[PDB]
Design a protein around this ligand. Structure first.
Ligand SMILES: COc1ccc(C2(c3nc(NCCN)c4ccc(N5CCN(C)CC5)cc4n3)CC2)cc1
Length: 300
């Protein structure tokens, strides 16, 4: 991890970057701010190329569509809490997800959005903005405090609050038992396994395949080739994470590295070719009126 770029929010003495993702245009990073703006930076020169007022509160999350035409954003306490934005020609809101704190695109075909409202998953059509499904069963709920509903790689299944749902039938096919208070889980990009906090579960037998105590309270992200898994631990303008992330082999879940950048992390992502890792790193203290974040790009 060799840092090869670094920059802060132009003209802000308290740099307010909160989240980042690469755009479909390689040299250009998308970042959210603690005041609700979407910025586009040149990830090498640190030049601010563009700025949009998307929300009334800090952006917590953004996901561009692979084709470059759409962007999801989520916010902290503003209404709508999440939104879908067209980026062809003019930047503009297509749909708003009024009380979803988190949103994700479907994976195989990006024709759908899945949103989380506490313990409830909402699935929407991109083209209409209509809610196609509500996935919630109060008897099966685990009430995970950081629940983030997600689709599997083939879009036929949803993981919501540690419950596995068949999308076509809107049936709960399995509830994974609750073994932590916070982390709800992700699908492995291989589609054979789900990672719920420290437990790796088989998707056919629901067998426990690995116990990985190092993953406790970690938000997990794969690289685009699905060979490396990045974990950043939640800590118990307050960052969601601490000052370190860990990498694992996505195949056997062996630890590769533990990097302490010694600055609280707000977010991290990779380019689609997995050459770089962008990290939003806070300068100065937990106990500060504000944050002062920078974006650092590391060559992997
Ligand atoms: C599975 O565990 C999870 C799941 C989801 C999250 C969320 C998140 N993710 C972030 N970035 C990583 C994903 N984009 C955030 C970044 C900054 C930030 N705060 C908000 C308030 N404000 C005072 C300063 C900025 C809040 C964030 N919340 C809500 C999506 C965190 C941990």
């Amino acid at each position: 991890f060799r840092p090869i770029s670094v920059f802060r929010e132009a003209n802000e003495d308290e740099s307010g970057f909160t989240c980042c993702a690469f755009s479909a245009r390689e040299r250009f990073l998308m970042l959210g701010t603690c005041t609700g703006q979407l910025k586009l930076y040149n990830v090498f020169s640190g030049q601010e190329e563009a700025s949009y007022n998307c929300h009334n509160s800090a952006i917590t999350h953004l996901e561009p569509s692979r084709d470059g035409s759409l962007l999801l954003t989520s916010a902290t306490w503003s209404q709508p809490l999440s939104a879908l934005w067209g980026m062809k020609s003019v930047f503009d809101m297509k749909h708003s997800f009024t009380e979803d704190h988190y949103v994700e695109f479907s994976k195989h075909s990006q024709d759908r959005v899945i949103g989380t409202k506490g313990d409830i998953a909402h699935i929407y059509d991109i083209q209409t903005g209509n809610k196609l499904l509500t996935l919630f069963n109060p008897d099966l709920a685990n009430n995970y405090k950081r629940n983030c509903a997600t689709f599997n790689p083939t879009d036929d299944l949803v993981l919501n609050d540690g419950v596995l749902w068949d999308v076509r039938s809107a049936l709960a096919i399995h509830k994974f038992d609750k073994f932590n208070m916070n982390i709800s889980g992700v699908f492995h990009p291989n589609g054979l396994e789900v990672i719920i906090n420290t437990e790796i579960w088989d998707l056919r037998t629901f067998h426990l395949l690995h116990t990985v105590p190092a993953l406790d309270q970690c938000r997990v992200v794969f690289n685009h080739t699905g060979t490396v898994m990045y974990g950043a631990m939640l800590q118990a303008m307050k960052s969601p994470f601490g000052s370190s992330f860990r990498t694992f082999n996505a195949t056997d879940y062996k630890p590769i590295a533990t990097i302490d950048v010694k600055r609280n992390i707000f977010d991290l992502c990779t380019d689609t070719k997995d050459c770089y890792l962008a990290v939003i790193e806070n300068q100065g203290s937990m106990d500060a009126l504000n944050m002062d974040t920078v974006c650092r790009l590391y060559e992997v």
